Amino acid sequence: MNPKRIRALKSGKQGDGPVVYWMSRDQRAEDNWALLFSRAIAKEANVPVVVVFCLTDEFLEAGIRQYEFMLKGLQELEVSLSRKKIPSFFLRGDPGEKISRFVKDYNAGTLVTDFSPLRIKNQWIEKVISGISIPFFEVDAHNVVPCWEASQKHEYAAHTFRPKLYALLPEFLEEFPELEPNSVTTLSDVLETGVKALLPERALLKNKDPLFEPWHFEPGEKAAKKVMESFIADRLDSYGALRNDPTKNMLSNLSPYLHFGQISSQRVVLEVEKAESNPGSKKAFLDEILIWKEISDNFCYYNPGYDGFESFPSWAKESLNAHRNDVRSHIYTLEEFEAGKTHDPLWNASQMELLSTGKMHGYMRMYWAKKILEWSESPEKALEIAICLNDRYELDGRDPNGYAGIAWSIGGVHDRAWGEREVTGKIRYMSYEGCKRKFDVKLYIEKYSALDK
DNA sequence: ATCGGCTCGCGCA
DNA sequence: TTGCGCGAAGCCGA
Numbered sequence: 091m092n093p094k095r096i097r098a099l100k101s102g103k104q105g106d107g108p109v110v111y112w113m114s115r116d117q118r119a120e121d122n123w124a125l126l127f128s129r130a131i132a133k134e135a136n137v138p139v140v141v142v143f144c145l146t147d148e149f150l151e152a153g154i155r156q157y158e159f160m161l162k163g164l165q166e167l168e169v170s171l172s173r174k175k176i177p178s179f180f181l182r183g184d185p186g187e188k189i190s191r192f193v194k195d196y197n198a199g200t201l202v203t204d205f206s207p208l209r210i211k212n213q214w215i216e217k218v219i220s221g222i223s224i225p226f227f228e229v230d231a232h233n234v235v236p237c238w239e240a241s242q243k244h245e246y247a248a249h250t251f252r253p254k255l256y257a258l259l260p261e262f263l264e265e266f267p268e269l270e271p272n273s274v275t276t277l278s279d280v281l282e283t284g285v286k287a288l289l290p291e292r293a294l295l296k297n298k299d300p301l302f303e304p305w306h307f308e309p310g311e312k313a314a315k316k317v318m319e320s321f322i323a324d325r326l327d328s329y330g331a332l333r334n335d336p337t338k339n340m341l342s343n344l345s346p347y348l349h350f351g352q353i354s355s356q357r358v359v360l361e362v363e364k365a366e367s368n369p370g371s372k373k374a375f376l377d378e379i380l381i382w383k384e385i386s387d388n389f390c391y392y393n394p395g396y397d398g399f400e401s402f403p404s405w406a407k408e409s410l411n412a413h414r415n416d417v418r419s420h421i422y423t424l425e426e427f428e429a430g431k432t433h434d435p436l437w438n439a440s441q442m443e444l445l446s447t448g449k450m451h452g453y454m455r456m457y458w459a460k461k462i463l464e465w466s467e468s469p470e471k472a473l474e475i476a477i478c479l480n481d482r483y484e485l486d487g488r489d490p491n492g493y494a495g496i497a498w499s500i501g502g503v504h505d506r507a508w509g510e511r512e513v514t515g516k517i518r519y520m521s522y523e524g525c526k527r528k529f530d531v532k533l534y535i536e537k538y539s540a541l542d543k
Numbered sequence: 544a545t546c547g548g549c550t551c552g553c554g555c556a
Numbered sequence: 557t558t559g560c561g562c563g564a565a566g567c568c569g570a
């Protein structure tokens with residue numbers, strides 16, 4: 091294992107108990123550098139490895155759709171793990187308090203957690219270090235090239251990060267070894283409890299039917315692989331040419347699995363690389379899962395204010411500021427945006443895709459966000475509303491790719507200046523008529539019309 | 544240091 | 557649609 095994937099959080103003396111993988115971002119049994127390191131650390135000490143996961147109360151901020159998708163994954167994973175003789179524990183509370191307690195409770199030898207740039211995981215980690223005395227390690231098991239290794243600074247753009255990343259790919263793109271089973275030796279209640287709490291909040295139809303259609307993405311490590319497999323057989327070949335067409339199902343559809351770590355993106359890269367197809371599609375796809383996925387982790391990790399105005403570049407701050415007092419053609423409230431009551435039937439269509447499938451087509455995510463800027467009273471409100479809806483209804487929400495993506499659309503982060511406009515200033519414009527030239531807009535609106543109810 | 548090159552709309556064929 | 561050349565625009569890093 092490449093030791094540059096390991097960061098030492100808290101130095102100390104190796105206790106003589108088990109090795110504890112605090113699993114958080116990467117909820118998979120396979121292709122998991124964090125669980126592989128733990129087992130290594132375990133194996134030399136002749137102790138077992140165990141996995142702990144903390145079900146916090148953040149689930150009350152989203153909906154049944156994300157929380158059933160996550161728990162059904164953890165149920166499968168639990169089985170996966172016990173078959174490898176690795177027990178799994180599940181705590182319910184504040185990771186700062188519960189993990190600390192647990193580590194003392196079970197006399198853990200060493201502590202290990204996977205990596206995530208989001209503000210709140212570092213808060214927990216800090217709290218955790220004050221509460222323990224054993225060594226504490228962190229492993230990047232989400233990125234092909236560990237976030238802190240790929241760059242030491244905020245990258246202004248893909249085209250600056252891209253040479254830095256591909257120089258290190260030969261070293262970090264590699265196969266995964268086997269999760270060796272242990273040698274030395276309730277989730278269902280939680281899920282029924284959580285839904286009963288979230289139920290008053292369900293996104294319902296007029297006839298009391300749920301909006302959300304749970305059949306588009308089956309959750310779990312197994313299903314995730316079958317999705318990847320299926321993208322490579324049918325859709326990879328056409329990806330470069332039809333990726334940007336909302337009327338063709340030609341995306342990988344991996345982002346819900348990746349978000350929850352139910353499959354490794356290092357694995358996808360390994361499998362796409364070895365696939366023969368259209369070079370242009372492979373190149374198109376690899377740029378998305380390598381450059382754009384991981385510069386997003388770079389963004390949050392070096393900009394703690396990643397979900398606010400002040401993280402924008404100077405030029406875009408200037409510009410939006412200078413157009414704060416422009417007359418907006420339209421001003422909608424969150425509640426109107428939420429229910430698709432704008433004047434723009436293409437915009438409403440894509441919000442109905444969001445509402446019922448929990449995954450809005452990549453290209454329409456750009457449109458969607460910019461019309462929120464154009465049709466709200468201020469850039470901050472735009473940011474607020476676009477974050478709110480993104481995180482509440484996307485299956486892949488509350489994710490670095492989220493904040494980095496919204497910042498692109500509303501703030502030109504990782505983007506450049508365009509012709510000055512009213513209201514949106516120099517931020518990249520997108521039009522209805524421009525979509526008309528690019529895809530059969532009417533089909534798209536047609537598909538999601540019968541939903542206004 | 545000096546300037547080439549970065550993930551839209553639109554005219555047009 | 558489909559692709560090209562052009563525009564408008566701020567800045568990093570050879």
Ligand SMILES: Cc1cc2c(cc1C)N(C[C@H](O)[C@H](O)[C@H](O)COP(=O)(O)OP(=O)(O)OC[C@H]1O[C@@H](n3cnc4c(N)ncnc43)[C@H](O)[C@@H]1O)c1[nH]c(=O)[nH]c(=O)c1N2
Nearest residue numbers: 341342343344345378379382383455456486487491492495
């Ligand atoms: C307004 C808005 C909001 C969001 C986002 C963009 C925009 C404009 N993104 C990014 C992007 O829209 C999203 O990752 C894709 O829809 C994922 O779907 P597929 O895997 O089918 O993409 P596709 O199959 O084409 O790409 C495969 C993978 O490449 C990566 N990728 C693709 N587009 C990317 C992008 N624009 N930025 C970064 N990585 C990208 C992702 O890992 C994705 O799973 C995001 N992503 C996310 O998963 N959750 C979110 O909540 C958001 N938030």
